[PDB]
Design a protein around this ligand. Sequence first.
Ligand code: HEM
Length: 137
Amino acid sequence: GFKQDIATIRGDLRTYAQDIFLAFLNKYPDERRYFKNYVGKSDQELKSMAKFGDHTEKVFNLMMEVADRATDCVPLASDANTLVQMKQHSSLTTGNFEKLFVALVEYMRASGQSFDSQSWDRFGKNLVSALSSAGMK
Ligand code: HEM
């Protein structure tokens, strides 16, 4: 289930974080514009670079904190607020997050592992609703 998936992801956080983030950028290439220092780099280039790994791991760490604090895939209002009020997220709309979660769910569906992809789809939908509520356009 969802709790197990959090454990799975945390167990190899840097690998999943990189793989899912790359799946996101490659499926939605226009999104790479928010990441000016990743423009013009292959997947293996980016994997070579500690800063790419560091960024992505920090993102997914927080994502797993928010997921673990959720009840039945419903995130806390407070966690939504953190994500909306972070300086780094000042130019984002809910669609940016929507894209990330579609990529994550598609990754899970493609993985051949028994991820609870339906729960991640719901968690993403709930988080998007909560960001919108916290003031995100
Ligand atoms: C649940 C989803 C997300 C979480 C948990 C999250 C979390 C974070 C965290 C923790 C940082 C700071 C990382 C660091 O210090 O290295 C960060 C930075 C950032 N995030 Fe997000 N993020 C999310 C979604 C997104 C999406 C969808 C976008 C854009 C499509 C985005 C764009 C950025 C950018 C541009 C930065 C700054 C890049 C940098 O200077 O390192 N985030 N995010």
